Design a protein around this ligand. Sequence first.
Ligand SMILES: [Mg+2]
Ligand SMILES: [Mg+2]
Ligand SMILES: [Mg+2]
Ligand SMILES: [Mg+2]
Ligand SMILES: [Mg+2]
Ligand SMILES: [Mg+2]
Ligand SMILES: [Mg+2]
Ligand SMILES: [Mg+2]
Ligand SMILES: [Mg+2]
Ligand SMILES: [Mg+2]
Ligand SMILES: [Mg+2]
Ligand SMILES: [Mg+2]
Ligand SMILES: [Mg+2]
Ligand SMILES: [Mg+2]
Ligand SMILES: [Mg+2]
Ligand SMILES: [Mg+2]
Ligand SMILES: [Mg+2]
Ligand SMILES: [Mg+2]
Ligand SMILES: [Mg+2]
Lengths: 140, 120, 55, 101, 107, 94, 95, 86, 41
Amino acid sequence: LRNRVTDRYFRIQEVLKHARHFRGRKNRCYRLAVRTVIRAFVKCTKARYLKKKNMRTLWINRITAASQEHGLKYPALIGNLVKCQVELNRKVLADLAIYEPKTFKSLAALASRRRHEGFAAALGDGKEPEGIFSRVVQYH
Amino acid sequence: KFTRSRIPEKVFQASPEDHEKYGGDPQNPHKLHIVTRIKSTRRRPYWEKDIIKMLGLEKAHTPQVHKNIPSVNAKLKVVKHLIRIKPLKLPQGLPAEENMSNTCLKSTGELVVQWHLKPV
Amino acid sequence: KVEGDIWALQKDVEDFLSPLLGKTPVTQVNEVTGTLRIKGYFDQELKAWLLEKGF
Amino acid sequence: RQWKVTSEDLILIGNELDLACGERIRLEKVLLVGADNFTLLGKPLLGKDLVRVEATVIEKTESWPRIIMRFRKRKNFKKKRIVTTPQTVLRINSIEIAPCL
Amino acid sequence: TARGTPSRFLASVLHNGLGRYVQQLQRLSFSVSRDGASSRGAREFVEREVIDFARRNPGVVIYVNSRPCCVPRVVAEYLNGAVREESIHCKSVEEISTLVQKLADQS
Amino acid sequence: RGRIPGRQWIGKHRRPRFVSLRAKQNMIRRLEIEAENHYWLSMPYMTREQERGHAAVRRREAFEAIKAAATSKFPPHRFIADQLDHLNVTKKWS
Amino acid sequence: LTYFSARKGKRKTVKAVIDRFLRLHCGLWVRRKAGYKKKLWKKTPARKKRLREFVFCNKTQSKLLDKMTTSFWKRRNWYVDDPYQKYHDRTNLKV
Amino acid sequence: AGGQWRLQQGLAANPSGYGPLTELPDWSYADGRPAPPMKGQLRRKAERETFARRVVLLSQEMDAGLQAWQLRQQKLQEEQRKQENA
Amino acid sequence: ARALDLLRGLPRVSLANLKPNPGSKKPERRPRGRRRGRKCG
RNA sequence: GAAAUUGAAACCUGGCGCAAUAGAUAUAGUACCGCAAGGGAAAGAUGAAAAAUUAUAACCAAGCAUAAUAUAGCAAGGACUAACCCCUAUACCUUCUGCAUAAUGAAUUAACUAGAAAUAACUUUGCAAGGAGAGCCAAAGCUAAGACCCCCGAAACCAGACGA
RNA sequence: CCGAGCCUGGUGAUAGCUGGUUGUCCAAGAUAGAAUCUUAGUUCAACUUUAAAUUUGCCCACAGAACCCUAAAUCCCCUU
RNA sequence: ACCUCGGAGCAGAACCCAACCUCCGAGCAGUACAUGCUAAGACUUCACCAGUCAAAGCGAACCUCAAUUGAUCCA
Ligand SMILES: [Mg+2]
Ligand SMILES: [Mg+2]
Ligand SMILES: [Mg+2]
Ligand SMILES: [Mg+2]
Ligand SMILES: [Mg+2]
Ligand SMILES: [Mg+2]
Ligand SMILES: [Mg+2]
Ligand SMILES: [Mg+2]
Ligand SMILES: [Mg+2]
Ligand SMILES: [Mg+2]
Ligand SMILES: [Mg+2]
Ligand SMILES: [Mg+2]
Ligand SMILES: [Mg+2]
Ligand SMILES: [Mg+2]
Ligand SMILES: [Mg+2]
Ligand SMILES: [Mg+2]
Ligand SMILES: [Mg+2]
Ligand SMILES: [Mg+2]
Ligand SMILES: [Mg+2]
């Protein structure tokens, strides 16, 4: 022997340092951790898109819930919001229902009024005075 | 077997019914086609994917301009089923040199020369 | 073996060989070794150019 | 991205703004502001003269080391990378509204 | 990893936002050497920018050991006493300036 | 009960997939805008022999720029500055 | 092909290609077309003259035997009464 | 949601594309000074600028091609008069 | 010359200040790791 | 696979050789195995003083105790106030058209274990119709350097010994 | 443990066949076929890669490409 | 049973295209003896080996068929 790695002790310890919380013989031995440490790291990467999808769909359940408490459903709700030009994402729309249901009631009342305005427009498209809240702002 | 499909030119002859629908007057025809991709490049022949790359529409939801002339028409005709086409029309004349930066596109194919960014 | 300011020499040959090719040369220089590297054989032209200048 | 915020509250952003620590800034965009008994919603946002949302920058970190591993099975495809994205901590010092309406 | 690493709720040191802002970096302790080729970045950084760094931040206090060291170090402790050491071994002056700047920025 | 022979998507017998109004509504939208396309790329602006030689100048000068870019290929320039800055690693105080 | 010998540890050229081919210093190799000495009675005149004429070699098979040969066979040789003197050099070759 | 409605009025299907939701400055100094432009806003303006310079190049070339034909036709009608005059 | 007046101000040359022309001695590439190690080409 | 021919310059006491799975097989051809030819090992470590067993040297592999178990599932990830409880997730390598595959190998830990090189090119120097410290190459080439080419495994064949 | 013993030596026998081949990071990249005591392989072709010289490459517009015995297309092709 | 070569369909329309897919054939024959020598330019049985066409000039007169066959060393 002329050339031998002396710091083999450390380059494996950093691997096991991240894998201390593993159960069984994985945290103790090396090769058991090598199979699981990269797999645990791989699951960490693509779990972000799961964190996005899970938390996104969770906000849908929350806003769908507060709407049903006030007598509406989520698909009709956001349709009236974007029709009435309010760009509030599902985070604040959900979080608003948590702390000020009085405000979310106004959002629901604002949304329900746009539905009746839209149905009035369904009866007569034009040839009538447009809805007061259905009126839009023109940017240029 | 599957090969390049030649299209009859008679199909691309607008009738008076089509004229009243899309509002495109035949006289005074527009000059430029706003092009945008929706369908994926994958699962298409080699000639369909390189043409749209030769047109420069590898990116989706990216408006890109082409000419309204019979030569380029043959290109996006064979790959017409990969893209959207919309004509170019503007009220405010061509973009002047002073208003090169403050331009802005619209969903209706408009290209406003001036953009001061606040409502009436 | 360019000695001194190579940038003055490479600029001279660039202006000298420009009209022959119709484009400015894009040659390479190495002031450490004091060398030049010019595309295309122009030795007979560079020889007469260096002689009439007196190098 | 949106945030629900008030006064005397912290907030983080996943990038650098090129602001020195301790400087104040006036935020332009607000979708709505609301008090105990009313709310001021925009179309989409509120006017400039209506509100004045001031916030101070206090602190800037490099993000904690986020590790990523791209792996494929039985083909010897694996790789590592560690990122430390820049982060900045703001705080909304105070919010006020104008009588103009 | 999130589960292997500890976590916390976001919070500032004694609410530095409302009142007068205070640079929450207390002290910097540079460990350079009169020799060692790796210390060229730290020494040239001591020549040019550490002077201006002190003029820019009168609040922060700086110390320089200038003792024999195979590897230069820079130690930084804050008001809370949280010590954080980073290695400036074989680093350019531009990187060290940005490094000391963000250390001054963070809490 | 309810198995199928072999693979679910090939062969003499596979799982018979059926259509939903969602997919129907999706595809009619794609070909009806293609009918809007079919109207627009008709009625051309110029004729074949009109647009013959109008852009040959740009395509020529553009290709000549690619030629100049291709010929412009050499190693980078070397300097005494960047060579002797390596000597400064042993810069040390008096 | 016999990269290192045993008595001196050098490449060894086989005398096969020596008898079959000939080198010009530019890197070219020629050869006599095969089948030029067999069954000439049945061949048309256009065929036998095509066989009598020399032929060059592709770059690959030329490169192949070039790997085989040694530097001694690649040197410049100034023979007398040699018609290949006009062809050892190359003239008017661009790219 | 609402993408079909937004393009009905002419707005972006995604509000992040264009409009006041993104194009305005997202922060300014407390003293009322204007903040520098954002990197997203700069590349968008450069994209629209090259887009505008491109469209002007595309239009003028077609106009040059149209008139260049009619100038050739006027030359064509000219030399036909020359034929009968000879 | 412009070459020598730099060296008088620049530090003294030694083994530590020594380096070859970049591009001459390219680094050796051994088959150890993920890239080459699997089959070594 | 040549030869004719040509013709070299030293004192030996040194190592960019190894440090107990290395280096001779070796503490020794010793133990042990085989009637025989022959095959063939393993190991030790205090301190100046052991006519000082003084004396935290204490902390480190696997393996265990100190300290068993808690509905449910590649042993984890996102996380969460909270370990679990929720959503997500078909081990590693080889092989193959294609594998969680119920195809191969792997109990685990420590140590050892597997890409050596020539013309011909290319990069960097040097000099230049010359180059190279005889010899060799040459219609800008020549000289020098650089990087480029793995291990384990059979039934067998032959010669000479040793055995009824 | 005799379809011909066992030991050493030639011997690191050879094996187109299996087994396995060690640090990090990035780019490009599966591609017609011919011959072979040849189909478990190899040489060439083609494809792919590196560093370069030069200029056309690709899509393609009218025209053009068989009698014999009524197809989707294909080849070439200035423009764009 | 087949192993090489040529023609037709599969392969309808530039080229190519396999199956122990469907058919018909070849391993010659006949007439001259310039069936002599050289030479531009090109194709090529998907590489190579091979196989092909040939202006013009010297020198002369005034080839058909489709496969119709075989490298190197050696003699
Ligand atoms: Mg989503
Ligand atoms: Mg099945
Ligand atoms: Mg030993
Ligand atoms: Mg232990
Ligand atoms: Mg579960
Ligand atoms: Mg599977
Ligand atoms: Mg491996
Ligand atoms: Mg299989
Ligand atoms: Mg298994
Ligand atoms: Mg097997
Ligand atoms: Mg045997
Ligand atoms: Mg034998
Ligand atoms: Mg007896
Ligand atoms: Mg026996
Ligand atoms: Mg072997
Ligand atoms: Mg890639
Ligand atoms: Mg062309
Ligand atoms: Mg061919
Ligand atoms: Mg003739």
